Design a binder for this molecule. Structure first.
Ligand SMILES: NC[C@@H]1O[C@H](O[C@H]2[C@@H](O)[C@H](O[C@@H]3[C@@H](O)[C@H](N)C[C@H](N)[C@H]3O[C@H]3O[C@H](CN)[C@@H](O)[C@H](O)[C@H]3N)O[C@@H]2CO)[C@H](N)[C@@H](O)[C@@H]1O
Lengths: 272, 49
RNA sequence: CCCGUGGUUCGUGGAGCCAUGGGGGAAUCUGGGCGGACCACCGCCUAAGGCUAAGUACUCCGGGUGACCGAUAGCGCACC
RNA sequence: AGGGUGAAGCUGGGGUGAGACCCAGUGGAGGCCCGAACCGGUGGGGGAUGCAAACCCCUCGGAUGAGCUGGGGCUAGGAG
RNA sequence: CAUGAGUAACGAUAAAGAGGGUGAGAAUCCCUCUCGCCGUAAGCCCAAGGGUUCCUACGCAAUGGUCGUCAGCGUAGGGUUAGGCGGGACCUAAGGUGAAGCCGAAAGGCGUAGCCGAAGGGCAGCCGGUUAAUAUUCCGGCCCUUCCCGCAGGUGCGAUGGGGGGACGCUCUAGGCUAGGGGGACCGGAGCCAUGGACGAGCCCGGCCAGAAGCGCAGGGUGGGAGGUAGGCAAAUCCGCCUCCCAACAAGCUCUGCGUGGUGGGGAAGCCCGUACGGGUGACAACCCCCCGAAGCCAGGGAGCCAAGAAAAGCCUCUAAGCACAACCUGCGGGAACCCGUACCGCAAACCGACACAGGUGGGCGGGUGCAAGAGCACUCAGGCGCGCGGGAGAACCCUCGCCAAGGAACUCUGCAAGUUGGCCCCGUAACUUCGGGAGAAGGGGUGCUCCCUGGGGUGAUGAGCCCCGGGGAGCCGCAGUGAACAGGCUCUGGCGACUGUUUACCAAAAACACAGCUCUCUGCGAACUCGUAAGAGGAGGUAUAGGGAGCGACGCUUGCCCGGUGCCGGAAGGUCAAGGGGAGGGGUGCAAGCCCCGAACCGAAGCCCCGGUGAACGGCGGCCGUAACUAUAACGGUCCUAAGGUAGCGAAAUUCCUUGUCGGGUAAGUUCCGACCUGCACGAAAAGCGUAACGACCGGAGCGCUGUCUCGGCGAGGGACC
């Protein structure tokens, strides 16, 4: 029920460089799931470019485990949703009920794993940080206990356990930074399920992108009647500005944001 | 040649009606205004069927 | 009483009194704002609750009068 | 409407260790290719108080996709 | 109220001519007879929307673009009725409302819940007959629907709260049934040879449609238990988790074919009569046989592929609590069932454009022949017409369309146009290439129809039952054999751009913008922005492979020189200043304690200065002078200047004015383009630079082909012009 990434159509005219992926569980989801409105327009004013749609399923997923902190679960199997950067495992809880959950590193259908008060540090179970075997990996992870799985490292194979101090453990998050969460808080054990996805290649843009749902963006689009920047000519403007009365693209946003100093440091950057 | 007309028993009837006018304050207001300021009636009455 | 503002014949000013948005932050008739930014005087009024009549306004509607109009002026509109 | 194209998987036959990979059959995917209904509307032509407040003709592009379309709705006018 | 004007014009070049009729008058009404155009629509059909009108009877002064005894016109009267069609008496999404709640100077903003709110859900009938007129609504035959009263048999019955459940892409697609095509000389029938012929498997007409369920084709939708039954999906045997047996092409329970009760219809002619709307009409039928079949139906299939496809009845399943003695499941009898709806127009003179405007406007085969296939083609079936002003000769000339020869672009800014050319089958097919392809490259050749020998996929084996090519052979007639209508002109080459596209409604088919894919860079989620007066939503039930700002824009090679100024990014040591904290001190009044100013030593926020950082960040990347045996530049030869001073590729280009630059090619000649050169008036990598196959209604340069296009064209047909 894993999934092929690479399959690429071939020379079926410019449908060139189209990357397929196929989770093998292929089953159509199950019983627990509604749908999302057609947002893009919202609070009934309209906003943010692109946006279009394309077919309609729509998710409900588990984001909180302490709610059975124990009932082993066995991979119902693999599958996913018209959302999320890295598929899911519909899991079965030994008590009858099941739940759509993450999809850490390639686990295995039928596999038992669970979590709570002491779970075996086997990628799959989840645990209050504290049970953090420092130097290990998780994601999903949530600071401010109860505030549900906060930091759903999307396909975000990224929760790197980095030491502890006080009632907070240190973590290396996607981004390339290290924040802190009080141990009692929690983490889904292990890592994500998708990345190659991230590399996926798609053919005739219009076709693909739109299918994605998203349409466009078109800067200093000539007639700068608005389009912040210049136009009514070839030449790329100067000032150094962006759409809807913008600050270019090299300035802050944070602030006192009591948030900030409160934890984390590394400051915002990487260097591949 | 989509000369924009082509009404809809529904749509038009719909969009506009006594109710509706009384709903929006502007609706109501204009209502009375016209109504007794100069007689007539109310197209939101104009309706058919 | 400090600044941030409204009133008022006051548009920033030596600019007073009433009035309030911020922070300060009390006096029972030796009480306390008010005449003169302000200080010494005399004087003035009695504040931070309540009630209403009567004299000017208005014209739907009625009556009446017109060096006010005659059907393209008069209400556009003298009559389904 | 209709027609051609002819990938991927697979099945078998072919060559190493198995394998690559080949060939053949199957297949019959979106791009699509051809071309009506459908949707656009240059290229030339035909009206100037024209069938018409944007047309008729000969013609031409897409002809499963960011496609076309009836019904039901929300955003609107210094806003969309 | 005049004026061109009694000229321009009548709404489509889909033609009409006759006879009789009725009339005050009939090109322009009625019948009937000749005749053309639709037919894939000028068909019918549902729906929308119109809302009169529809009919029947009188009438025409207004109205139709004149007519007019015609009407959709005027006057009057009559005309659509349904437990089972539809919609509500039910369900719900988006979506509006909104008891709560959060929120505004006010008016409101936001809003769960419950509600309103759909040809999206769900639900019980069909066919034959009858009116001037309406119909599965009426009549009749046939088949049911729930709800109420009862009774008869049967049960833990008994919410709508838990659950299971109805529920869902797209592409495609096996198997199975009517629709629905089609030949039956196959049976019924009213007739015929007119004309050289044939009365002969001749023509012409028809040879069904509905039918409880009973039943026979297809399939169409799965598990029995038991127990544990640490979830339950709060409350309990119903689901789901674990386990041991039976888990059978299993019995299961939901549409077709026959049924057949059985009813009903049943057409040609034909000729009798009404205007017609019509009717008798032959027994009145014969109503059987064989062929082809779908995107329809069974069916929620079945495979494959992602971009991975809605919420309320029904079956159960327990409280409430009744039930359980009168609750539910189930037969028979009895009795009930209301509200709003049809007329007709209705791809259009009745719906939308102010007109009987040739514009537009949603789904239902779309009869037949032929064509490889087919809603395109040409002629037609039914069914629909004949556009509503006529007759007339027919000259100018615009229109529409036809033919040419001699030459075949010289016309011309442009081969604008138009002609060439085009239907399938076989021979065959270039530089280049992302080896997908450019190929319908390109260039040939073919087909018609006869008779003859020869193989095939159909259908109950398979034998008058059909579709595929056969294959080949001899031969037949035309200038001619996709014989008419559907139907590529082509090749070479260059700039741009990738290619699919959207737009510019009103010129601007097409670059621009898309874009896939590049890089910078922004944000830690109560992200960052976007609207908002809070409230709040949005964002994202997403959660830095993620969500934003951006210049570019497949891909290939490749992105170099400066951050001294600008913005942005980093550090406040220091200089620097608002309010403030503030007190030195001066000050007016104070006989006086005192009351009150001014007040400024010092502390004091970002910012600003300052110091680094900094281009896929604004934005820029030079000037001059000298030297190698001689005659020509090239190397630094040091200097003036600044931040350095433009690399790689690139060049007279969608940037060279001197320019029709100079050479070269093309050419009788060419400022045109291709190639060179390169002293680049004023290219350069990121608003990309050089290149780069495929793809363009791209724009430009060749050349073969063809053609009243050009040397003038010349006659010709159809329409106005003209009487
Ligand atoms: N290594 C240098 C190589 O040669 C050139 O260098 C260039 C550059 O460096 C240098 O530029 C310098 C700059 O001071 C400024 N532009 C003024 C100065 N006159 C100039 O120098 C010039 O004049 C010099 C004295 N008369 C001579 O050495 C020579 O002619 C020339 N270099 O001069 C060269 C030409 O402008 C190429 N540009 C480069 O690509 C290549 O690598």
């Amino acid at each position: 029920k894993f999934k092929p990434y690479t399959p690429s159509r071939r020379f079926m005219t410019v449908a060139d460089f189209s990357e397929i992926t196929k989770t093998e569980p292929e089953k159509s989801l199950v019983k627990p799931l509604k749908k999302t409105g057609g947002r893009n327009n919202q609070g009934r004013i309209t906003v943010r470019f692109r946006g279009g749609g394309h077919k309609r399923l729509y998710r409900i997923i588990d984001f909180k485990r302490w709610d059975k902190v124990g009932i082993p679960a066995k991979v119902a199997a693999i599958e996913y949703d018209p959302n999320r950067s890295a598929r899911i495992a519909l899991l079965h809880y030994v008590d009858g009920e099941k739940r759509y959950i993450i999809a850490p590193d390639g686990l295995q259908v039928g596999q038992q794993v669970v979590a709570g008060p002491d779970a075996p540090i086997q990628v799959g179970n989840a645990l209050p940080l504290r049970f953090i075997p420092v130097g290990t990996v998780v994601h999903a992870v949530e600071l401010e206990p109860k505030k549900g799985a906060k930091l759903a490292r999307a396909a975000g194979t990224s929760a790197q356990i980095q030491g502890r101090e006080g009632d907070y453990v240190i973590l290396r998050l996607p981004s390339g930074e290290l924040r802190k969460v009080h141990g009692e808080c929690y983490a889904t054990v292990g890592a994500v399920g998708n990345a190659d996805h991230k590399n996926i290649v798609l053919g005739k843009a219009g076709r693909s992108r739109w299918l994605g749902r998203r349409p466009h963006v078109r800067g200093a689009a000539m007639n700068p009647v608005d389009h912040p920047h210049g136009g009514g000519e070839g030449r790329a403007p100067r000032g150094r500005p962006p759409a809807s009365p913008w600050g270019w693209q090299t300035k802050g946003l944070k602030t006192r944001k009591r948030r900030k100093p409160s934890s984390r440091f590394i400051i915002a950057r990487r260097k591949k | 040649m989509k000369r924009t007309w082509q009404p809809n028993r529904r749509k038009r009837a719909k969009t506009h009606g006594f109710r509706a006018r009384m709903r929006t304050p502007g609706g109501r207001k204009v209502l009375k205004r016209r109504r007794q300021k100069g007689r007539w009636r109310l197209t939101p009455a104009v309706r058919k069927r």
